[PDB]
């Protein structure tokens, strides 16, 4: 037995936490990313990068702590602890936002490790690897949003911060500056996510309400056995119900479950494509025909133009605080605003 086979045997032992070869990448990187996030949200400020308190130590709460993006001055520097910025100084590395690339890169490699784990375990137990394929969607989201978007922009500063309110800020930023809601790729993402939730709810309810009477208890949960060969709910009854209620119904179980995979995954992939577009400011910001008409016709008003006005307001009022490195000085009189407000 060669040493490689012996190692392979040890890594793939049946234990409470499977390790595998993929574990060598997953567990250290995932632990680094998680511990980095926890450390930053507990102890680390964003005073020098954003002028914000972002840790429990500073008095922030769960909703307002974040591992904030690094200072815009560094561009897309990877900000290694040993890099030319921190130069091995851990305190300075924390202060310049070095924890953000730490978490982002370790999380990217952890995600790779987790999907490799899906592949490895699928191969070991002898099933098709569709779980890894489904997980490609979250990977596309993470790559586009946390890497490609800031890479197309001026710096990592404009990446989403790892935090609840940081993410909320990123969301509102994308609305105001990119008109992200108007983006058809985002609308396909929304369709996929809401459709996935709908499919989850409707399938769970349909199964639970077409169950066969296989026990005597009012508690129907123990009238199932994992090794039983027969279906536990009536597909025929479900199909008739949905055909008469909704007009159409699934008749193929396999197609049903592939659809439940397909819808949210495609939603994630389409939204990731849209985010890639936004990385280069290739926005679906305006409808030029309506802009031109409004510019020449002061009685043409649509919900689109109203939303454009909202975006202008958000940008002007938010930019000085959101982008402190720019030293934006917008005097009170240049701020757009409606009457009396």
């Amino acid at each position: 037995r060669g040493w490689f086979d012996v190692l392979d045997d040890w890594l793939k032992r049946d234990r409470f936490v499977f390790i595998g070869w993929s574990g060598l990448l997953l567990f250290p990187c995932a632990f680094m990313a998680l511990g980095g996030w926890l450390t930053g949200t507990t102890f680390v400020t964003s005073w020098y990068t954003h002028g914000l308190a972002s840790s429990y130590l500073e008095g922030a709460n769960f909703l307002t702590v974040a591992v904030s993006s690094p200072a815009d001055a560094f561009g897309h520097s990877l900000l290694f602890l040993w890099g030319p910025e921190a130069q091995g100084n851990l305190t300075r590395w924390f202060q310049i936002g070095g924890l953000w690339p730490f978490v982002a890169l370790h999380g990217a490699f952890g995600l790779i490790g987790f999907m490799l784990r899906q592949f490895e375990i699928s191969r070991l137990v002898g099933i098709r690897p569709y779980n890894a394929i489904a997980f490609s969607g979250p990977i596309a989201v993470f790559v586009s949003v946390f890497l490609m978007y800031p890479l197309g922009q001026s710096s990592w500063f404009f990446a989403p911060s790892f935090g609840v309110a940081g993410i909320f800020r990123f969301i509102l930023f994308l609305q105001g500056f990119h008109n992200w809601t108007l983006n058809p790729f985002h609308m396909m993402g929304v369709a996929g996510i809401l459709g996935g939730a709908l499919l989850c709810a409707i399938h769970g309810a349909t199964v639970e309400n077409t169950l066969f009477e296989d026990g005597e208890d009012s508690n129907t949960f123990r009238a199932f056995e994992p090794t039983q060969a027969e279906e536990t709910y009536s597909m025929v009854t479900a199909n008739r119900f949905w055909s008469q209620i909704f007009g159409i119904a699934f008749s193929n179980k396999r197609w049903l479950h592939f659809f439940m995979l397909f819808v949210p995954v495609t939603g994630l992939w389409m939204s990731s494509v849209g985010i890639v577009g936004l990385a280069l400011n290739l926005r679906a910001y305006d409808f030029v025909s309506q802009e031109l008409r409004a510019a020449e016709d002061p009685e043409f008003e649509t919900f689109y133009t109203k939303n454009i006005l909202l975006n202008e307001g958000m940008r002007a009022w938010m930019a000085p605080q959101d982008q402190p490195h720019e030293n934006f000085i917008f005097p009170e009189e240049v701020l757009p605003r409606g009457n009396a407000l």
Binding site: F212, E213, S218
Partner: protein
Amino acid sequence: GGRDLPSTGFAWWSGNARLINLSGKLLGAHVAHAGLIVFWAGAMTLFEVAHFIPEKPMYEQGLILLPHIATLGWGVGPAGEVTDIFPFFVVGVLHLISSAVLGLGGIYHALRGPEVLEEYSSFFGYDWKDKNQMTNIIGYHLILLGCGALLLVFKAMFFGGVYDTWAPGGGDVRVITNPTLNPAIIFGYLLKAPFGGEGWIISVNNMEDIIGGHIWIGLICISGGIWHILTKPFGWARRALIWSGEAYLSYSLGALSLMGFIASVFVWFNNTAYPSEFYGPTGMEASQSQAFTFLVRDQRLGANIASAQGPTGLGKYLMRSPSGEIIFGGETMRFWDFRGPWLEPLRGPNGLDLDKLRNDIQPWQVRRAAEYMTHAPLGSLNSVGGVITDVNSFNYVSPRAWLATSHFVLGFFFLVGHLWHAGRARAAAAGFEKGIDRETEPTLFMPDLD
């Protein structure tokens, strides 16, 4: 009865379903739960009394029970000034002690009392299918409910009265000597559209109507109680309804959902049964108050507020409702159906009256409008008052907001519970609540759809 899954068919997380046919244990559960309700009433009242600063308004201090006592005319005087703090304390103490008694009884019946009551007594023993006995329990409780309504009437008429925010000379506790028993008014309330300007029963705006409607409710409830004690359900009711414990529960759940929604709307809009003295302004009231406050200020500055047109061309301060009435301008145009004791003195037959606006505005109305405008029912979940973009220094959320939100949520979830139990009761009565029988799966005997 059994107390586990094998002997009952119900898991622990549905353990109360094991009580459906154990009438004594079920009675214990109900009595103990009633003890919980009364305990909360007493303890919350004592908490609110302890945390009460009696020279600050009730609505500024997160109080929801003390306003209920004040509205009933206890411990308050003109404009809602808290005269005596002792009656609030007494209400709380009495509820706490009685909750002790109720909890003792509920524990006795739930833990040691007879499991079922039917072989103990015919009077208290019941069967869900025993239609006559169920209508007997309905009758007893209807008599009690009518009696409670008459208790409200007696308090308003013979025991010091209730707080009347519409009283001349200022809102005050007054005795209602002439309740309107006229069934035209009382039951025409029930026929008013549930839309803006009509406000189906939320629009009741004088304590005479409230007390008279409660006299009618008391009589209706007592007579219906007798009617149900002395009869059994008719054939049509028997053929239309499911007759089971869970079915009766579902019926009550639907009723409760309806009442929860109604109460949320009632506290949001009505300022008669919920005087703004104790509950703060309604949102409509606060919006109208802001419009009034700036009409007054700008008029003092010299603005001719009758002829001042705003940027859009509509009157800045005054305008017409779609039916022509003179109303406050601005966004508060939507709130022109608002009526309040501080604003009606400036209202003429056509709406807001220019002569009264120009020379009849009193300093107390200005103060009241400023207070109501600054206590608009807007606030954050962590109790930061004002619009959501305001900063953290104003700790206020309107009691109306708390009550309306809570009771809309409870109404919704009780509609959900009604759907759950109604569907389950139907399925169980028809016998497929445990799933489809493989042998006699109904869809297998049906023609194909196409």
